Amino acid sequence: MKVHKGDTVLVISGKDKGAKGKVLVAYPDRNKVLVEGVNRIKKHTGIVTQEAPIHVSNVMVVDSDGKPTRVGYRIDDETGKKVRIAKTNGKDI
Amino acid sequence: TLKVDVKTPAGKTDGSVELPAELFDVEPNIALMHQVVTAQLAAKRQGTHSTKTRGEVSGGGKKPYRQKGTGRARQGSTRAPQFTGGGTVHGPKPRDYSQRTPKKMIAAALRGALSDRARNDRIHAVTELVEGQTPSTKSAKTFLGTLTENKKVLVVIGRTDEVGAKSVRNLPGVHVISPDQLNTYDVLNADDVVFSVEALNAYISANSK
RNA sequence: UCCGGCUCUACCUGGCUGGAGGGCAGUGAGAAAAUGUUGUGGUUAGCGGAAAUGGCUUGGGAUGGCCUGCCGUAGACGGUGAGAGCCCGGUACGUGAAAACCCGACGUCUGUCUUGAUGGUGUUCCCGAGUAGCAGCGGGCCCGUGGAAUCUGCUGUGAAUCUGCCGGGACCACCCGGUAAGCCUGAAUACUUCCCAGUGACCGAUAGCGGAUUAGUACCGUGAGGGAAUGGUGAAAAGUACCCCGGGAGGGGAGUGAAAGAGUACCUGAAACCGUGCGCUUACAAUCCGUCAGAGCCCUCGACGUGUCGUGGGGUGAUGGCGUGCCU
RNA sequence: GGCGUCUGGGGGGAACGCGGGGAAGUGAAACAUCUCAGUACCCGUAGGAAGAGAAAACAAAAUGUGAUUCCGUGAGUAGUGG
């Protein structure tokens, strides 16, 4: 999904647009993620408050310098691996 | 005789092409062109619409119940058209809509459309759409903007002009056609018709010969 | 070509047969089973792939409106909280196979010709037999028995080998064409259980497959067989904590939600059908149930005063006149 | 005939192929010849296709074509038919 558990993302659409958070659960079969402090609901248990999954298209991976980007891939020729890179600055993310 | 001056993507005039009268000066014929384009669109249409008649629907081979004594209507099958789930009476079946339009009518309609375009000097000739060997949509878009400011354009280039076709492929209002595939519908759908010099010469050679 | 061994036996002459080059063909109809190397040749998983967190405003939400940029060999199509080329999957365009299989190619391999070839001269033999032909009874040919050729089944009879035989729509003569009773043969053609990729001036839940839901299911029949009905909360379940009436069901507050005139009996929510409330009317009256006049009452819009008309409008209608439902 | 040992077969499958058997409703305003129709159905067999195929052919005096198959015409014609 180009975004993984433990990544930090910026919400680019929805109610919580502009809020930064950390991906704690990823749902590849749903294209949804769980992000800290965004999309919080008020479930009636008393009435507790917790996050709800958000479509993976509404978030963007932030750079080392905190700027959102599309993520791309470069191939390392030494080991045959394949790492995620930022398209804004080229640095490794 | 109407004169078309060739333009290059560099922005300068190259030469001229003489448009023959019998190809670009015929009097447009509205009814003829209407018939030709209607036949064209009918040939395009595919009739893949079908229904099941009273005999193709499943089951219903046995006469249901007592004709008499019941006090009910007499029914010969459960698939009769008046029944829910029964067959269709006069429903669509697959068919071909193409028409056998005469050749002279088609050619005359094309000539009328092109002559209408040439009367209002909507015909342009260029040496090439872009500098060769590498497609570039920006350059082709700029060149087309210089040529015309209209919305829909028709680009007529040779089948070997791959770079130009790829260059103008992505533009929303551009439709690309080969010189031997010129037709009334595509001409009449376009505000401007930009010709390639080789394509223009090929069309003239095919017709005026 | 050369060498070798045989044509009763050896000698000198003509033919059969092996071994070396040289070819020539190949899994092919023309004989066959194999076995190797190679082809970014193909198929069977994939991977990369440009450009907006843009500004203002509406809004729960922007993917709307207005205004700025940018990519484009990519403005196909979908998704994303409402119409997205620049958010996501992708798209143009490039790339990728250990193994298996399929196509090629070059080889081992096999067969095969070389004991060979040419154009000349006058005669005997051979050229597909229970066959052709004929007759009887049928089939099928435009041809339904007809003057009925060609082809063909059963039953009888039954020839010739080239100056022989068959055909040219009865048949005969002459010309012409061909060579039966032996066998193989690719392409052009037909089709889609199944797999892959697409398309629609095709359907959109009584439609489209019988089957969008337990579908050849439930159910019916001894059996062969027949054969249904049933889609939509919301963007997210955030699916109503807690309190009250009640045995529960159900409801009222309270919350969630943009909306509960979205509460898992859930989009929209028509008609028939069933209520409740208000206005007018109706218990001396013979009614195809309306229509034309029409008092009274109620409501409403204008003008002037206090209620009283008007180029008014609506509801109900006591009462009078007329009036024999629709279709076939 | 028996005994032993090797190699095959058997059944399924939607359409298409080939070879056999073969209706009736219907039309003819009745009906039997005829039509329907060599259809429906049935039997035997395949192959990726099958079947056919290399003149005992046409043709008509042309010093003419040259295996088979399939497509268009010829042509609803020549004909054939209670």
GROMACS .gro file of N, CA and C (backbone and C1' of nucleotides) in nm, chain B residues 41 45-46 48-49 52 57-60 62 79 84-85 88 135-138 141 166 169-170 172, chain C residues 70-76 92-94 199-202 206-210 216 226-229:
model
  240
  134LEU      N    1  -2.259   0.605  -3.890
  134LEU     CA    2  -2.290   0.575  -3.751
  134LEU      C    3  -2.369   0.446  -3.738
  138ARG      N    4  -2.252   0.110  -3.512
  138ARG     CA    5  -2.334   0.050  -3.408
  138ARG      C    6  -2.333  -0.102  -3.417
  139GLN      N    7  -2.313  -0.168  -3.303
  139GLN     CA    8  -2.321  -0.313  -3.295
  139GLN      C    9  -2.451  -0.352  -3.228
  141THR      N   10  -2.579  -0.600  -3.044
  141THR     CA   11  -2.569  -0.714  -2.954
  141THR      C   12  -2.674  -0.705  -2.844
  142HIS      N   13  -2.799  -0.697  -2.887
  142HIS     CA   14  -2.914  -0.693  -2.798
  142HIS      C   15  -3.006  -0.808  -2.834
  145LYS      N   16  -3.525  -1.360  -2.522
  145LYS     CA   17  -3.572  -1.497  -2.540
  145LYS      C   18  -3.720  -1.496  -2.573
  150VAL      N   19  -3.734  -1.957  -2.354
  150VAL     CA   20  -3.729  -1.948  -2.209
  150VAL      C   21  -3.741  -2.088  -2.150
  151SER      N   22  -3.688  -2.104  -2.029
  151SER     CA   23  -3.674  -2.237  -1.970
  151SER      C   24  -3.810  -2.297  -1.935
  152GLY      N   25  -3.821  -2.428  -1.955
  152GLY     CA   26  -3.938  -2.501  -1.910
  152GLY      C   27  -4.061  -2.471  -1.993
  153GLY      N   28  -4.177  -2.484  -1.929
  153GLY     CA   29  -4.303  -2.453  -1.992
  153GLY      C   30  -4.340  -2.539  -2.111
  155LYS      N   31  -4.520  -2.830  -2.075
  155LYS     CA   32  -4.640  -2.903  -2.039
  155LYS      C   33  -4.757  -2.807  -2.021
  172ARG      N   34  -4.503  -2.009  -1.988
  172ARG     CA   35  -4.410  -1.917  -2.052
  172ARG      C   36  -4.477  -1.832  -2.159
  177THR      N   37  -4.582  -1.364  -1.599
  177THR     CA   38  -4.458  -1.315  -1.541
  177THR      C   39  -4.349  -1.420  -1.557
  178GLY      N   40  -4.235  -1.379  -1.611
  178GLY     CA   41  -4.127  -1.471  -1.638
  178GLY      C   42  -4.135  -1.538  -1.773
  181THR      N   43  -4.067  -1.294  -2.448
  181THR     CA   44  -4.091  -1.163  -2.506
  181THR      C   45  -4.151  -1.180  -2.645
  228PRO      N   46   0.849   1.194  -2.928
  228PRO     CA   47   0.719   1.256  -2.905
  228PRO      C   48   0.726   1.362  -2.796
  229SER      N   49   0.651   1.470  -2.816
  229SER     CA   50   0.646   1.578  -2.718
  229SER      C   51   0.510   1.644  -2.730
  230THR      N   52   0.427   1.629  -2.626
  230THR     CA   53   0.293   1.686  -2.630
  230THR      C   54   0.294   1.837  -2.612
  231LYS      N   55   0.391   1.891  -2.538
  231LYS     CA   56   0.398   2.036  -2.521
  231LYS      C   57   0.424   2.106  -2.654
  234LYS      N   58   0.121   2.077  -2.881
  234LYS     CA   59   0.014   2.163  -2.832
  234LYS      C   60   0.040   2.309  -2.865
  259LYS      N   61   0.189   1.014  -3.183
  259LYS     CA   62   0.208   1.005  -3.038
  259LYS      C   63   0.213   1.143  -2.974
  262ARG      N   64  -0.151   1.265  -2.951
  262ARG     CA   65  -0.246   1.162  -2.910
  262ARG      C   66  -0.328   1.205  -2.789
  263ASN      N   67  -0.264   1.268  -2.691
  263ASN     CA   68  -0.324   1.291  -2.561
  263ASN      C   69  -0.406   1.419  -2.553
  265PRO      N   70  -0.709   1.663  -2.570
  265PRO     CA   71  -0.852   1.627  -2.562
  265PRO      C   72  -0.930   1.650  -2.690
  372C        P   73   0.374   2.614  -1.523
  372C      O5'   74   0.388   2.456  -1.512
  372C      C5'   75   0.456   2.399  -1.401
  372C      C4'   76   0.415   2.256  -1.378
  372C      C3'   77   0.414   2.166  -1.499
  372C      O3'   78   0.543   2.123  -1.537
  372C      C1'   79   0.220   2.128  -1.370
  373C        P   80   0.571   2.081  -1.689
  373C      O5'   81   0.513   1.933  -1.700
  373C      C5'   82   0.563   1.829  -1.617
  373C      C4'   83   0.483   1.703  -1.634
  373C      C3'   84   0.467   1.652  -1.776
  373C      O3'   85   0.581   1.580  -1.820
  373C      C1'   86   0.259   1.644  -1.665
  374G        P   87   0.618   1.575  -1.975
  374G      O5'   88   0.494   1.501  -2.043
  374G      C5'   89   0.470   1.363  -2.021
  374G      C4'   90   0.336   1.323  -2.076
  374G      C3'   91   0.316   1.349  -2.224
  374G      O3'   92   0.371   1.247  -2.305
  374G      C1'   93   0.129   1.429  -2.104
  375U        P   94   0.506   1.272  -2.387
  375U      O5'   95   0.494   1.172  -2.510
  375U      C5'   96   0.375   1.168  -2.588
  375U      C4'   97   0.318   1.029  -2.598
  375U      C3'   98   0.281   0.963  -2.465
  375U      O3'   99   0.166   0.881  -2.483
  375U      C1'  100   0.443   0.831  -2.577
  376A        P  101   0.019   0.945  -2.474
  376A      O5'  102  -0.026   0.921  -2.324
  376A      C5'  103  -0.113   0.813  -2.291
  376A      C4'  104  -0.128   0.796  -2.141
  376A      C3'  105  -0.194   0.913  -2.068
  376A      O3'  106  -0.266   0.862  -1.956
  376A      C1'  107   0.018   0.873  -1.977
  377G        P  108  -0.421   0.822  -1.969
  377G      O5'  109  -0.486   0.944  -2.047
  377G      C5'  110  -0.517   1.065  -1.979
  377G      C4'  111  -0.651   1.119  -2.022
  377G      C3'  112  -0.669   1.134  -2.173
  377G      O3'  113  -0.805   1.108  -2.206
  377G      C1'  114  -0.700   1.342  -2.069
  378A        P  115  -0.841   0.999  -2.318
  378A      O5'  116  -0.916   0.885  -2.236
  378A      C5'  117  -0.843   0.799  -2.150
  378A      C4'  118  -0.898   0.659  -2.155
  378A      C3'  119  -1.002   0.623  -2.051
  378A      O3'  120  -1.132   0.668  -2.086
  378A      C1'  121  -0.843   0.450  -2.067
  394A        P  122  -0.138   0.079  -2.142
  394A      O5'  123  -0.065   0.203  -2.208
  394A      C5'  124  -0.125   0.276  -2.314
  394A      C4'  125  -0.038   0.391  -2.357
  394A      C3'  126   0.102   0.353  -2.402
  394A      O3'  127   0.107   0.314  -2.538
  394A      C1'  128   0.114   0.531  -2.247
  395C        P  129   0.192   0.186  -2.583
  395C      O5'  130   0.335   0.209  -2.519
  395C      C5'  131   0.421   0.312  -2.567
  395C      C4'  132   0.529   0.344  -2.467
  395C      C3'  133   0.631   0.234  -2.443
  395C      O3'  134   0.731   0.230  -2.543
  395C      C1'  135   0.559   0.322  -2.236
  396G        P  136   0.786   0.088  -2.594
  396G      O5'  137   0.821   0.011  -2.460
  396G      C5'  138   0.953  -0.036  -2.436
  396G      C4'  139   1.002   0.005  -2.299
  396G      C3'  140   1.079  -0.102  -2.224
  396G      O3'  141   1.215  -0.104  -2.262
  396G      C1'  142   0.918  -0.003  -2.081
  501U        P  143  -1.377  -0.247  -2.279
  501U      O5'  144  -1.488  -0.263  -2.392
  501U      C5'  145  -1.459  -0.227  -2.527
  501U      C4'  146  -1.571  -0.269  -2.619
  501U      C3'  147  -1.711  -0.233  -2.573
  501U      O3'  148  -1.745  -0.099  -2.604
  501U      C1'  149  -1.706  -0.457  -2.647
  502G        P  150  -1.850  -0.019  -2.514
  502G      O5'  151  -1.991  -0.052  -2.581
  502G      C5'  152  -2.008  -0.045  -2.722
  502G      C4'  153  -2.131  -0.120  -2.767
  502G      C3'  154  -2.263  -0.067  -2.712
  502G      O3'  155  -2.365  -0.080  -2.810
  502G      C1'  156  -2.234  -0.293  -2.645
  503A        P  157  -2.396   0.042  -2.910
  503A      O5'  158  -2.546   0.082  -2.878
  503A      C5'  159  -2.582   0.147  -2.757
  503A      C4'  160  -2.705   0.232  -2.776
  503A      C3'  161  -2.811   0.173  -2.867
  503A      O3'  162  -2.897   0.084  -2.798
  503A      C1'  163  -2.769   0.396  -2.931
  504C        P  164  -2.902  -0.071  -2.838
  504C      O5'  165  -2.796  -0.140  -2.741
  504C      C5'  166  -2.818  -0.146  -2.601
  504C      C4'  167  -2.875  -0.279  -2.560
  504C      C3'  168  -2.934  -0.286  -2.420
  504C      O3'  169  -3.064  -0.230  -2.412
  504C      C1'  170  -2.799  -0.475  -2.457
  508U        P  171  -3.861  -0.754  -0.953
  508U      O5'  172  -3.904  -0.820  -1.090
  508U      C5'  173  -3.895  -0.961  -1.110
  508U      C4'  174  -4.007  -1.011  -1.197
  508U      C3'  175  -4.020  -0.943  -1.333
  508U      O3'  176  -4.070  -1.038  -1.428
  508U      C1'  177  -4.218  -0.910  -1.210
  509A        P  178  -3.979  -1.088  -1.549
  509A      O5'  179  -3.891  -0.962  -1.587
  509A      C5'  180  -3.919  -0.883  -1.702
  509A      C4'  181  -3.803  -0.796  -1.738
  509A      C3'  182  -3.681  -0.868  -1.795
  509A      O3'  183  -3.693  -0.893  -1.933
  509A      C1'  184  -3.612  -0.716  -1.627
  510G        P  185  -3.641  -1.032  -1.994
  510G      O5'  186  -3.486  -1.034  -1.957
  510G      C5'  187  -3.396  -0.941  -2.014
  510G      C4'  188  -3.256  -0.963  -1.963
  510G      C3'  189  -3.210  -1.107  -1.957
  510G      O3'  190  -3.175  -1.162  -2.082
  510G      C1'  191  -3.153  -1.000  -1.757
  511C        P  192  -3.225  -1.309  -2.121
  511C      O5'  193  -3.150  -1.403  -2.017
  511C      C5'  194  -3.222  -1.476  -1.919
  511C      C4'  195  -3.154  -1.607  -1.890
  511C      C3'  196  -3.229  -1.706  -1.803
  511C      O3'  197  -3.325  -1.779  -1.877
  511C      C1'  198  -2.999  -1.698  -1.742
  512G        P  199  -3.481  -1.773  -1.840
  512G      O5'  200  -3.493  -1.855  -1.705
  512G      C5'  201  -3.616  -1.866  -1.636
  512G      C4'  202  -3.597  -1.924  -1.499
  512G      C3'  203  -3.487  -1.861  -1.416
  512G      O3'  204  -3.530  -1.744  -1.350
  512G      C1'  205  -3.473  -2.098  -1.405
  518G        P  206  -2.699  -2.459  -0.858
  518G      O5'  207  -2.746  -2.552  -0.978
  518G      C5'  208  -2.798  -2.683  -0.954
  518G      C4'  209  -2.939  -2.679  -0.901
  518G      C3'  210  -3.006  -2.815  -0.880
  518G      O3'  211  -3.093  -2.805  -0.767
  518G      C1'  212  -3.136  -2.688  -1.027
  528G        P  213  -3.790  -3.128  -1.679
  528G      O5'  214  -3.899  -3.060  -1.586
  528G      C5'  215  -4.032  -3.042  -1.631
  528G      C4'  216  -4.123  -2.997  -1.518
  528G      C3'  217  -4.091  -2.863  -1.456
  528G      O3'  218  -4.139  -2.754  -1.532
  528G      C1'  219  -4.132  -3.021  -1.286
  529G        P  220  -4.052  -2.620  -1.546
  529G      O5'  221  -4.025  -2.575  -1.396
  529G      C5'  222  -4.131  -2.530  -1.313
  529G      C4'  223  -4.085  -2.509  -1.171
  529G      C3'  224  -3.962  -2.423  -1.153
  529G      O3'  225  -3.989  -2.285  -1.164
  529G      C1'  226  -3.939  -2.616  -1.022
  530A        P  227  -3.874  -2.189  -1.221
  530A      O5'  228  -3.783  -2.160  -1.093
  530A      C5'  229  -3.797  -2.039  -1.021
  530A      C4'  230  -3.921  -2.037  -0.936
  530A      C3'  231  -3.933  -1.920  -0.841
  530A      O3'  232  -3.984  -1.804  -0.904
  530A      C1'  233  -3.978  -2.119  -0.724
  531A        P  234  -3.898  -1.669  -0.907
  531A      O5'  235  -3.925  -1.604  -0.765
  531A      C5'  236  -4.057  -1.580  -0.720
  531A      C4'  237  -4.060  -1.556  -0.571
  531A      C3'  238  -3.954  -1.461  -0.518
  531A      O3'  239  -3.994  -1.325  -0.529
  531A      C1'  240  -3.954  -1.658  -0.388
   0.00000   0.00000   0.00000
